[PDB]
Amino acid sequence: FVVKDIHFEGLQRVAVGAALLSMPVRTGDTVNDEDISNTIRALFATGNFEDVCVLRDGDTLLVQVKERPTIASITFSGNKSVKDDMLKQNLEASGVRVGESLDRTTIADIEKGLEDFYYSVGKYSASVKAVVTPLPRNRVDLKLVFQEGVSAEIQQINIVGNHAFTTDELISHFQLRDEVPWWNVVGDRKYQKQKLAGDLETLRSYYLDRGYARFNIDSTQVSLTPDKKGIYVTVNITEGDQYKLSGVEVSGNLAGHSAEIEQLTKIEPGELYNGTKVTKMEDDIKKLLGRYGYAYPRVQSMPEINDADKTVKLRVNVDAGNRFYVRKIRFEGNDTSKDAVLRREMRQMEGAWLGSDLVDQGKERLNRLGFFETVDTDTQRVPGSPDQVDVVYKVKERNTGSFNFGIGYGTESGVSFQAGVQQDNWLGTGYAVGINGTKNDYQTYAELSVTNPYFTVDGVSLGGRLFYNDFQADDADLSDYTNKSYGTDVTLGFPINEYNSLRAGLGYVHNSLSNMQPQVAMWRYLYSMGEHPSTSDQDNSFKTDDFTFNYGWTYNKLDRGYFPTDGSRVNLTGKVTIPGSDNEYYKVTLDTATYVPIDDDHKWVVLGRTRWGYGDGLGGKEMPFYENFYAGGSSTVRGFQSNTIGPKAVYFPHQASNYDPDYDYECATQDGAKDLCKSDDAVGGNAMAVASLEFITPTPFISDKYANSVRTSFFWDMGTVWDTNWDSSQYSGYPDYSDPSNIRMSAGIALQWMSPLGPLVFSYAQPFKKYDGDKAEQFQFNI
Amino acid sequence: EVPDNPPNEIYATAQQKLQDGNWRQAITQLEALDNRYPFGPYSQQVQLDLIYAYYKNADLPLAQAAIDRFIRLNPTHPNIDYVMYMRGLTNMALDDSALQGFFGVDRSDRDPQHARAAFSDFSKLVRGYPNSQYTTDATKRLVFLKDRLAKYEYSVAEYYTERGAWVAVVNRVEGMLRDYPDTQATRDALPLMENAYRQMQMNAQAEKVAKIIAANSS
Amino acid sequence: RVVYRPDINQGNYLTANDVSKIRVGMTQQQVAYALGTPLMSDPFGTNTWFYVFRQQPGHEGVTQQTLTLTFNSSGVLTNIDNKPALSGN
Amino acid sequence: VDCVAAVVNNGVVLESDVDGLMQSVKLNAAQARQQLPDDATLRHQIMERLIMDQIILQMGQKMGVKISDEQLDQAIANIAKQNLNYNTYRNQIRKEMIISEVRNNEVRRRITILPQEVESLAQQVDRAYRMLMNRKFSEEAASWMQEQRASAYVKILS
Amino acid sequence: CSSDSRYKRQVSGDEAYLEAAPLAELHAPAGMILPVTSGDYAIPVTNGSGAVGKALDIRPP
Amino acid sequence: NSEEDVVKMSPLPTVENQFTPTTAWSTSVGSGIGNFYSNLHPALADNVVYAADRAGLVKALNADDGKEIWSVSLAEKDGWFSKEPALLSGGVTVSGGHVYIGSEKAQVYALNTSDGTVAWQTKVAGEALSRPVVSDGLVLIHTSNGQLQALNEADGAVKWTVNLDMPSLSLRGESAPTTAFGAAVVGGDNGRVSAVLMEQGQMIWQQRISQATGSTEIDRLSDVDTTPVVVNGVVFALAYNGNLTALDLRSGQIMWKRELGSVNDFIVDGNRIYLVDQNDRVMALTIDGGVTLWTQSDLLHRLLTSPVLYNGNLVVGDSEGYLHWINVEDGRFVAQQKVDSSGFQTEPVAADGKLLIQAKDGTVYSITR
């Protein structure tokens, strides 16, 4: 009949007129009394409703609506192998997430999906149950209950159908494990469905590259024990027969470079048909075509076989394409470091033909810089002209500023501290700046350095360094070992090729030291300088000004800039005094770090570190003692202490030397002073040699999301320091420090983590081969 | 984490905290009210309050997500222009985020993706609702954004001139003329293109650029 | 000198065999098929196509090959200029 | 007045259809000495029928299998020589034909006749082949219906 | 030390964009066409009659 | 490690020993079945026992003494190693003057009983995991690929290779066929019982019984891996996931089905079918209509073996080693007997007024009153 109005009881998801957008009644016509059914069908088919009830008890249309509830919270429990992070993404992908409506179809879909995943991994006695608890004001809560029963243990892998290879040899290389060694915990026996396909492909390639061509896998089964405990994987093969490569021929729209393709395609006659060799040939053809510009070549290799004479004649069809050009190079993610410090690392120049190798090499150079965590390349073709393409680099800038605060000693010295900051990427400008200063009742020290890697746009890098160390024994400047030292350094370096650098520079430093303790090495140095001071009284003064010309070489082919995973680095630094300086000496230092990977994933890495060092004087003038090397602590032989490896000073009889307070300053003073006495104070020699071997392994309590920020290493470490000059007479009753065979050694574990304060290393070190005056330490924390 | 209370008082305490400004505490109350009362009488007000609180809390990703959520369910509303304005403000404020203001470093050649993402927003705003009360600020920020993008392209062109890749210089400056013609950066950049032609022995192509620079010297 | 200078390439490269294919008469599309989209083109007035093939070996003579094509305002070639450059500097 | 009888998959089942079918199919055979059960159980009988008719109907749209109007015209011409509102009758027939057709589409595809039991039936009793096809159709259709009833959402609203 | 100016109804960014130079379009030199008539980044001519900078009281109204 | 959360309920029955059973003898054929699922079991022939293991060892034994007669090792002499395991997995079947043994490396051996020599050793496509069935001068093997192959009894001579289907999650242990009136009835890993004319190798009828209308078809395997048994013109069958069926032998018409199904081995007395569910519920049914006469569900997840009707008692093993004796009517734990801690998962067999069982390690036992 006639309807006056339309009234509803659904108020949340239904709009004002969006409801009426579907009904045909229009409140302005007589009702057929049957089309109401069609109206309800359409309304519920809109998908925004759950129950619809039309009433015309009076003279109007009342549509009782039961809107679908809006999910308000997500609870799930009993799951072990499916973590929340992936489950949330899986639920969100299928269009269910908190805040939107619920559809009963998606519930069944999610149950099926999760049960499918468990059947894939192996929890065959598993079933997720999703139940919705109603909540007032028409809401629901979704609950998931997981019966993760148990993974079935794969029992045996059978390769019946082989007649040239033993089963064990074949099943050794499979990613799945037949039997785990008894006395090992190397692996497991879970059946991952993807690993099955991986191993089937592995077997196919294995027979395919030892010669057998007419080889194929008939059928693979996955039996199951009638208890859902064991899985018996079976593979059937057609062994086939061996073959030889009769001759490989190339054809197609090959570009003008046919000579190099022919040279690549040459193979010594008589070889066995190898599939991986064919893939290698195709890949290198693609690379050689890419280097000239054809970045998208179609290469198809067909092994036409003659099964009557053990012969295959591979046909290689090549279609190069067009010489692509890069239209523009864009950078994304460099939110701090300005655009220049990316565009200057490139080797694929803008507005040129696409050199498919130059892009990858530029990506390598960007990665090596040391201040990008993840750098990824993406060559995407522009949707217009046939041959244009944009190379887009996506970077994620990482922290690159190292901080260092702390205290000189626990006793209340007073406003005495140590500070530090080193920025590799100061405000992203590219400059490397570093400043630190420690003031203490023992010493006062302050240094600064600024380096610009690209003073001009070729690589010519310019740097300067200043320092001030007039510590004068801040405890007291009277009758104390006083040393005011300072100088300046300026260097610049240029590259020779893509993996080298040479630096040269100048500097001058002067040292004024007064009231020195008497001991053998220092007095030898003073005798060399042309000084003949006394021993018991300590009032001598020495001022020396040195003008040093210094040089260095740097080879850096390293896959990453922050605990890398592959490559090599060598760093040589030397200095020579120029004529006219007070001291005539020369010093040479060499550093080397080599990272070799053993696994495709680049997670287990062998690290070989080594350092060598030799310094001496020229023209009968000894090398100054204050330039002596050291060892120990971190960054060297780790496990003893910083600067405690090598010679120990032998004090002359010290007595009545200016002021000697009682119960302090007891270096060698004694009323019954006998003779020279051995001590434990380290002075450093002029021959340095340290080596270290590290096994780098993943940390066993971390996910991949944080895997690149923590590194764990097991190190065996060795090192030794000794003096090139010696006295048989003055060291008759004391160990001969000139002998370089007294090698200190240690081993231990190291933890490395990159914190917002900078990189941190925690190490636990056990020494093995020690000597006197080591005071070895087991824990070492450093920044 | 909130006591169960009738709607009026929980909204009142949320607004009181917002008057105070403790956004870390106001967002909790707003989220609780919205989650408990999804499609109530005044869910729109809760959504807009979430936008304001998220923005002033420097919580840019969630503010962006809430803007992009609300832009759909209410395509027409007397405050949709406000939502677009805050979308643009979110993008642009997200761009200029670092310490470099303290030290005074001209952020011009950093990533421009945020700048363009904001320009699209403010263009939509000034094109759709030209009589609103936010339009003049949008216009000024549009001028600033165009100047900034032109400066970025100019920086790339200048580096390529220094490096020696001339064709890059020519293409970049031609693009700057094509897209950002009325700014001051492209006026600064014309001499680079003139030199790029001259160094390639293209007198018949550098003469015209010399004429243009001469004409617009003023 | 001594400072390492990476190899620099600055435009589309055209081989003499492909150059011989182009003569007066063909439309734009056939030229694009022959040589590819020109990397540099004129924005001012007459639509002229520049093909500049320029190379810097690095501490060696910069080499340049210029091909200037003038297309009349209908879509067909009018004249060409195949300059080996190497003039003056 | 109007209410929803049941929900299926994405479609719906109306009170109107079950209410009409409850009596509209039982009155004709009452004169043929038919003793139907009580209303309640027969209602669930019709419920089980209708819930499946729907599933088949949405299945036909899932696949995208249609029937031309000409087949309807020829079939109603057949009905003219064989034996609501006119358009309602035609809308009923349009879906009824596809609901019936999906059964014969699936069964013939999943049936398997080996030419061996035909000889056994011929020796026991061209009629044998027809008997075999009828039996195999019946069994496979029952199995298919049973498995389809399992993989579709359903609820009871009474 | 202290927060922004009342940190309410005040934009989080600075007011440094108001110093932006006004836009002056290039004019066409003698007998030669410019490519400038190819833009996409157009600024529709909008009047004043509104607040600016720190005076734009942002509030969910 | 932390994920081992299995759901199961394995209780031990009430101690009720109404009579004492005792062990006649043992042999210790050696490490045999072990952890691997298989179908090895001895068989009787003229007061002799023939036993085997997975190492290739084959032994002959006498009754009441266990005194060894002959024994050979079938190590892979033909190969590179001459010591590779032969992987005997087929059940031991004695017939006439031969003992047929299957292998998982696609080999079938026919040993020559007392002498111990090999009559012939042939290769059949795919793994052979079934009981070799002897019939009418032929051997039937159900390889684990769906290929039912028939061999000449005298020597090899593959006659026909009937093809079946193989869904890719079938549970292990393919069924061995039953021969009657020139027809071999064989189950397949796809849920369908098929009859093959056993004179050329031509199919007669292939009928489906496994109605696994499960929500998750991926795990509703629904294969048949029990030997169908024939009484008069009606043959019975059991899918893994349900639908016990009694169906006509002449055609593919189902006489009647029962929803319990879900079995891997069963026995028929000619009037009362006894069987074991997946859940180790031992029950009996009437052949006439399938009325569940009686049930016993005290056990659950004990992983039983096939029942054996010996002296009116249904004897059955379990995983922990106990042998359980069930009354012929209504069920009752008439006697328990612990005879080995090694374990049971093969099939006990009894005939000729005896009883024989094989554990996973201790191998042959004879269980007697």
JSON list of C-alpha atoms in Angstrom, two decimals, chain D residues 7-143:
[
{"chain": "D", "resi": 7, "resn": "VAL", "atom": "CA", "xyz": [22.17, -16.24, 5.64]},
{"chain": "D", "resi": 8, "resn": "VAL", "atom": "CA", "xyz": [24.42, -18.03, 3.15]},
{"chain": "D", "resi": 9, "resn": "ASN", "atom": "CA", "xyz": [27.86, -17.20, 1.76]},
{"chain": "D", "resi": 10, "resn": "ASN", "atom": "CA", "xyz": [27.23, -13.63, 0.65]},
{"chain": "D", "resi": 11, "resn": "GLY", "atom": "CA", "xyz": [23.57, -14.05, -0.34]},
{"chain": "D", "resi": 12, "resn": "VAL", "atom": "CA", "xyz": [20.53, -14.43, 1.89]},
{"chain": "D", "resi": 13, "resn": "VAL", "atom": "CA", "xyz": [17.40, -16.56, 2.37]},
{"chain": "D", "resi": 14, "resn": "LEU", "atom": "CA", "xyz": [14.00, -14.95, 2.95]},
{"chain": "D", "resi": 15, "resn": "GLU", "atom": "CA", "xyz": [11.14, -15.96, 5.22]},
{"chain": "D", "resi": 16, "resn": "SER", "atom": "CA", "xyz": [8.82, -15.52, 2.23]},
{"chain": "D", "resi": 17, "resn": "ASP", "atom": "CA", "xyz": [10.28, -18.39, 0.22]},
{"chain": "D", "resi": 18, "resn": "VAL", "atom": "CA", "xyz": [10.17, -20.96, 3.02]},
{"chain": "D", "resi": 19, "resn": "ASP", "atom": "CA", "xyz": [6.69, -19.86, 4.09]},
{"chain": "D", "resi": 20, "resn": "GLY", "atom": "CA", "xyz": [5.36, -20.21, 0.54]},
{"chain": "D", "resi": 21, "resn": "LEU", "atom": "CA", "xyz": [7.09, -23.54, -0.06]},
{"chain": "D", "resi": 22, "resn": "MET", "atom": "CA", "xyz": [5.87, -25.01, 3.24]},
{"chain": "D", "resi": 23, "resn": "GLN", "atom": "CA", "xyz": [2.33, -25.43, 1.91]},
{"chain": "D", "resi": 24, "resn": "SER", "atom": "CA", "xyz": [2.64, -24.69, -1.82]},
{"chain": "D", "resi": 25, "resn": "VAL", "atom": "CA", "xyz": [4.29, -28.07, -2.51]},
{"chain": "D", "resi": 26, "resn": "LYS", "atom": "CA", "xyz": [2.33, -30.32, -0.12]},
{"chain": "D", "resi": 27, "resn": "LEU", "atom": "CA", "xyz": [-1.26, -29.56, -1.12]},
{"chain": "D", "resi": 28, "resn": "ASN", "atom": "CA", "xyz": [-1.10, -31.14, -4.59]},
{"chain": "D", "resi": 29, "resn": "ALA", "atom": "CA", "xyz": [-0.04, -34.60, -3.36]},
{"chain": "D", "resi": 30, "resn": "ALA", "atom": "CA", "xyz": [-2.50, -34.64, -0.45]},
{"chain": "D", "resi": 31, "resn": "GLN", "atom": "CA", "xyz": [-5.12, -36.00, -2.86]},
{"chain": "D", "resi": 32, "resn": "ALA", "atom": "CA", "xyz": [-2.55, -38.68, -3.79]},
{"chain": "D", "resi": 33, "resn": "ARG", "atom": "CA", "xyz": [-2.53, -40.02, -0.20]},
{"chain": "D", "resi": 34, "resn": "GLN", "atom": "CA", "xyz": [0.60, -38.32, 1.12]},
{"chain": "D", "resi": 35, "resn": "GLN", "atom": "CA", "xyz": [1.09, -38.15, 4.90]},
{"chain": "D", "resi": 36, "resn": "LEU", "atom": "CA", "xyz": [3.63, -35.38, 5.44]},
{"chain": "D", "resi": 37, "resn": "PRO", "atom": "CA", "xyz": [5.30, -34.95, 8.86]},
{"chain": "D", "resi": 38, "resn": "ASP", "atom": "CA", "xyz": [4.55, -32.09, 11.23]},
{"chain": "D", "resi": 39, "resn": "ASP", "atom": "CA", "xyz": [5.23, -28.46, 10.34]},
{"chain": "D", "resi": 40, "resn": "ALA", "atom": "CA", "xyz": [8.38, -28.03, 12.44]},
{"chain": "D", "resi": 41, "resn": "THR", "atom": "CA", "xyz": [10.49, -30.87, 11.02]},
{"chain": "D", "resi": 42, "resn": "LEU", "atom": "CA", "xyz": [9.29, -30.28, 7.46]},
{"chain": "D", "resi": 43, "resn": "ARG", "atom": "CA", "xyz": [10.34, -26.66, 7.93]},
{"chain": "D", "resi": 44, "resn": "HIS", "atom": "CA", "xyz": [13.90, -27.81, 8.58]},
{"chain": "D", "resi": 45, "resn": "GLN", "atom": "CA", "xyz": [13.57, -30.14, 5.58]},
{"chain": "D", "resi": 46, "resn": "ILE", "atom": "CA", "xyz": [12.73, -27.17, 3.35]},
{"chain": "D", "resi": 47, "resn": "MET", "atom": "CA", "xyz": [15.49, -25.23, 5.15]},
{"chain": "D", "resi": 48, "resn": "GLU", "atom": "CA", "xyz": [18.10, -27.81, 4.18]},
{"chain": "D", "resi": 49, "resn": "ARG", "atom": "CA", "xyz": [16.82, -27.77, 0.61]},
{"chain": "D", "resi": 50, "resn": "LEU", "atom": "CA", "xyz": [16.78, -23.97, 0.28]},
{"chain": "D", "resi": 51, "resn": "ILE", "atom": "CA", "xyz": [20.20, -23.42, 1.84]},
{"chain": "D", "resi": 52, "resn": "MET", "atom": "CA", "xyz": [21.65, -25.66, -0.88]},
{"chain": "D", "resi": 53, "resn": "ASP", "atom": "CA", "xyz": [19.63, -24.10, -3.70]},
{"chain": "D", "resi": 54, "resn": "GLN", "atom": "CA", "xyz": [21.14, -20.77, -2.75]},
{"chain": "D", "resi": 55, "resn": "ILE", "atom": "CA", "xyz": [24.69, -22.13, -2.60]},
{"chain": "D", "resi": 56, "resn": "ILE", "atom": "CA", "xyz": [24.30, -23.47, -6.12]},
{"chain": "D", "resi": 57, "resn": "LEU", "atom": "CA", "xyz": [22.83, -20.17, -7.29]},
{"chain": "D", "resi": 58, "resn": "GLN", "atom": "CA", "xyz": [25.75, -18.08, -6.03]},
{"chain": "D", "resi": 59, "resn": "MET", "atom": "CA", "xyz": [28.09, -20.76, -7.38]},
{"chain": "D", "resi": 60, "resn": "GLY", "atom": "CA", "xyz": [26.70, -20.16, -10.86]},
{"chain": "D", "resi": 61, "resn": "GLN", "atom": "CA", "xyz": [27.57, -16.48, -10.56]},
{"chain": "D", "resi": 62, "resn": "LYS", "atom": "CA", "xyz": [30.96, -17.34, -9.07]},
{"chain": "D", "resi": 63, "resn": "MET", "atom": "CA", "xyz": [31.83, -19.28, -12.22]},
{"chain": "D", "resi": 64, "resn": "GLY", "atom": "CA", "xyz": [29.96, -16.88, -14.49]},
{"chain": "D", "resi": 65, "resn": "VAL", "atom": "CA", "xyz": [27.72, -19.41, -16.22]},
{"chain": "D", "resi": 66, "resn": "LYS", "atom": "CA", "xyz": [24.55, -17.96, -17.74]},
{"chain": "D", "resi": 67, "resn": "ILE", "atom": "CA", "xyz": [21.46, -19.22, -19.55]},
{"chain": "D", "resi": 68, "resn": "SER", "atom": "CA", "xyz": [20.05, -17.36, -22.54]},
{"chain": "D", "resi": 69, "resn": "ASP", "atom": "CA", "xyz": [16.47, -16.11, -22.52]},
{"chain": "D", "resi": 70, "resn": "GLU", "atom": "CA", "xyz": [15.74, -18.19, -25.62]},
{"chain": "D", "resi": 71, "resn": "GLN", "atom": "CA", "xyz": [16.14, -21.40, -23.61]},
{"chain": "D", "resi": 72, "resn": "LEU", "atom": "CA", "xyz": [13.60, -20.02, -21.14]},
{"chain": "D", "resi": 73, "resn": "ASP", "atom": "CA", "xyz": [11.25, -19.30, -24.03]},
{"chain": "D", "resi": 74, "resn": "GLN", "atom": "CA", "xyz": [11.57, -22.80, -25.47]},
{"chain": "D", "resi": 75, "resn": "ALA", "atom": "CA", "xyz": [11.16, -24.35, -22.01]},
{"chain": "D", "resi": 76, "resn": "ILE", "atom": "CA", "xyz": [8.00, -22.36, -21.27]},
{"chain": "D", "resi": 77, "resn": "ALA", "atom": "CA", "xyz": [6.71, -23.40, -24.70]},
{"chain": "D", "resi": 78, "resn": "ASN", "atom": "CA", "xyz": [7.40, -26.97, -23.56]},
{"chain": "D", "resi": 79, "resn": "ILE", "atom": "CA", "xyz": [5.47, -26.27, -20.35]},
{"chain": "D", "resi": 80, "resn": "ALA", "atom": "CA", "xyz": [2.59, -24.97, -22.49]},
{"chain": "D", "resi": 81, "resn": "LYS", "atom": "CA", "xyz": [2.30, -28.41, -24.10]},
{"chain": "D", "resi": 82, "resn": "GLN", "atom": "CA", "xyz": [3.31, -30.30, -20.92]},
{"chain": "D", "resi": 83, "resn": "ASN", "atom": "CA", "xyz": [0.92, -29.47, -18.08]},
{"chain": "D", "resi": 84, "resn": "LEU", "atom": "CA", "xyz": [2.07, -14.57, -7.84]},
{"chain": "D", "resi": 85, "resn": "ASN", "atom": "CA", "xyz": [2.73, -12.63, -11.03]},
{"chain": "D", "resi": 86, "resn": "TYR", "atom": "CA", "xyz": [3.99, -13.41, -14.52]},
{"chain": "D", "resi": 87, "resn": "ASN", "atom": "CA", "xyz": [7.35, -11.67, -14.15]},
{"chain": "D", "resi": 88, "resn": "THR", "atom": "CA", "xyz": [7.82, -13.22, -10.71]},
{"chain": "D", "resi": 89, "resn": "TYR", "atom": "CA", "xyz": [7.21, -16.63, -12.29]},
{"chain": "D", "resi": 90, "resn": "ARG", "atom": "CA", "xyz": [9.80, -15.85, -14.96]},
{"chain": "D", "resi": 91, "resn": "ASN", "atom": "CA", "xyz": [12.37, -14.63, -12.42]},
{"chain": "D", "resi": 92, "resn": "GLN", "atom": "CA", "xyz": [11.85, -17.86, -10.50]},
{"chain": "D", "resi": 93, "resn": "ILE", "atom": "CA", "xyz": [12.37, -19.95, -13.62]},
{"chain": "D", "resi": 94, "resn": "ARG", "atom": "CA", "xyz": [15.48, -18.00, -14.64]},
{"chain": "D", "resi": 95, "resn": "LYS", "atom": "CA", "xyz": [17.34, -18.92, -11.46]},
{"chain": "D", "resi": 96, "resn": "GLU", "atom": "CA", "xyz": [15.76, -22.39, -11.25]},
{"chain": "D", "resi": 97, "resn": "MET", "atom": "CA", "xyz": [17.20, -23.36, -14.63]},
{"chain": "D", "resi": 98, "resn": "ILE", "atom": "CA", "xyz": [20.77, -22.38, -13.70]},
{"chain": "D", "resi": 99, "resn": "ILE", "atom": "CA", "xyz": [20.40, -24.03, -10.28]},
{"chain": "D", "resi": 100, "resn": "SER", "atom": "CA", "xyz": [19.48, -27.27, -12.03]},
{"chain": "D", "resi": 101, "resn": "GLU", "atom": "CA", "xyz": [22.12, -26.81, -14.73]},
{"chain": "D", "resi": 102, "resn": "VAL", "atom": "CA", "xyz": [25.10, -26.49, -12.40]},
{"chain": "D", "resi": 103, "resn": "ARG", "atom": "CA", "xyz": [24.41, -29.99, -11.06]},
{"chain": "D", "resi": 104, "resn": "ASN", "atom": "CA", "xyz": [24.57, -31.57, -14.52]},
{"chain": "D", "resi": 105, "resn": "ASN", "atom": "CA", "xyz": [27.63, -29.46, -15.33]},
{"chain": "D", "resi": 106, "resn": "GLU", "atom": "CA", "xyz": [29.60, -30.75, -12.35]},
{"chain": "D", "resi": 107, "resn": "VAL", "atom": "CA", "xyz": [28.46, -34.38, -12.33]},
{"chain": "D", "resi": 108, "resn": "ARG", "atom": "CA", "xyz": [29.18, -35.11, -16.00]},
{"chain": "D", "resi": 109, "resn": "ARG", "atom": "CA", "xyz": [32.65, -33.65, -15.49]},
{"chain": "D", "resi": 110, "resn": "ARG", "atom": "CA", "xyz": [33.37, -35.72, -12.37]},
{"chain": "D", "resi": 111, "resn": "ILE", "atom": "CA", "xyz": [31.71, -38.95, -13.57]},
{"chain": "D", "resi": 112, "resn": "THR", "atom": "CA", "xyz": [33.77, -41.86, -14.91]},
{"chain": "D", "resi": 113, "resn": "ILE", "atom": "CA", "xyz": [32.26, -44.69, -16.97]},
{"chain": "D", "resi": 114, "resn": "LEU", "atom": "CA", "xyz": [34.45, -47.64, -17.75]},
{"chain": "D", "resi": 115, "resn": "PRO", "atom": "CA", "xyz": [33.17, -49.75, -20.66]},
{"chain": "D", "resi": 116, "resn": "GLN", "atom": "CA", "xyz": [33.34, -52.91, -18.55]},
{"chain": "D", "resi": 117, "resn": "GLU", "atom": "CA", "xyz": [30.42, -52.84, -16.12]},
{"chain": "D", "resi": 118, "resn": "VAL", "atom": "CA", "xyz": [28.17, -52.06, -19.10]},
{"chain": "D", "resi": 119, "resn": "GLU", "atom": "CA", "xyz": [28.82, -55.57, -20.42]},
{"chain": "D", "resi": 120, "resn": "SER", "atom": "CA", "xyz": [28.13, -57.03, -16.98]},
{"chain": "D", "resi": 121, "resn": "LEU", "atom": "CA", "xyz": [24.80, -55.19, -16.78]},
{"chain": "D", "resi": 122, "resn": "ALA", "atom": "CA", "xyz": [23.93, -56.21, -20.36]},
{"chain": "D", "resi": 123, "resn": "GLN", "atom": "CA", "xyz": [24.57, -59.85, -19.47]},
{"chain": "D", "resi": 124, "resn": "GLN", "atom": "CA", "xyz": [22.65, -59.51, -16.20]},
{"chain": "D", "resi": 125, "resn": "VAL", "atom": "CA", "xyz": [19.32, -57.93, -17.15]},
{"chain": "D", "resi": 126, "resn": "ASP", "atom": "CA", "xyz": [21.61, -49.87, -24.47]},
{"chain": "D", "resi": 127, "resn": "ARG", "atom": "CA", "xyz": [19.35, -49.57, -21.44]},
{"chain": "D", "resi": 128, "resn": "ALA", "atom": "CA", "xyz": [22.17, -50.80, -19.19]},
{"chain": "D", "resi": 129, "resn": "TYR", "atom": "CA", "xyz": [24.32, -47.80, -20.07]},
{"chain": "D", "resi": 130, "resn": "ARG", "atom": "CA", "xyz": [21.45, -45.45, -19.22]},
{"chain": "D", "resi": 131, "resn": "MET", "atom": "CA", "xyz": [20.91, -47.24, -15.89]},
{"chain": "D", "resi": 132, "resn": "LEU", "atom": "CA", "xyz": [24.61, -46.93, -15.09]},
{"chain": "D", "resi": 133, "resn": "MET", "atom": "CA", "xyz": [24.67, -43.23, -15.96]},
{"chain": "D", "resi": 134, "resn": "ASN", "atom": "CA", "xyz": [21.59, -42.60, -13.81]},
{"chain": "D", "resi": 135, "resn": "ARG", "atom": "CA", "xyz": [23.09, -44.35, -10.79]},
{"chain": "D", "resi": 136, "resn": "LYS", "atom": "CA", "xyz": [26.49, -42.69, -11.09]},
{"chain": "D", "resi": 137, "resn": "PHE", "atom": "CA", "xyz": [24.85, -39.28, -11.53]},
{"chain": "D", "resi": 138, "resn": "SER", "atom": "CA", "xyz": [22.74, -39.83, -8.43]},
{"chain": "D", "resi": 139, "resn": "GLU", "atom": "CA", "xyz": [25.65, -40.86, -6.23]},
{"chain": "D", "resi": 140, "resn": "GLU", "atom": "CA", "xyz": [28.08, -38.20, -7.42]},
{"chain": "D", "resi": 141, "resn": "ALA", "atom": "CA", "xyz": [25.46, -35.47, -7.10]},
{"chain": "D", "resi": 142, "resn": "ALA", "atom": "CA", "xyz": [24.71, -36.51, -3.53]},
{"chain": "D", "resi": 143, "resn": "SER", "atom": "CA", "xyz": [28.42, -36.50, -2.66]}
]
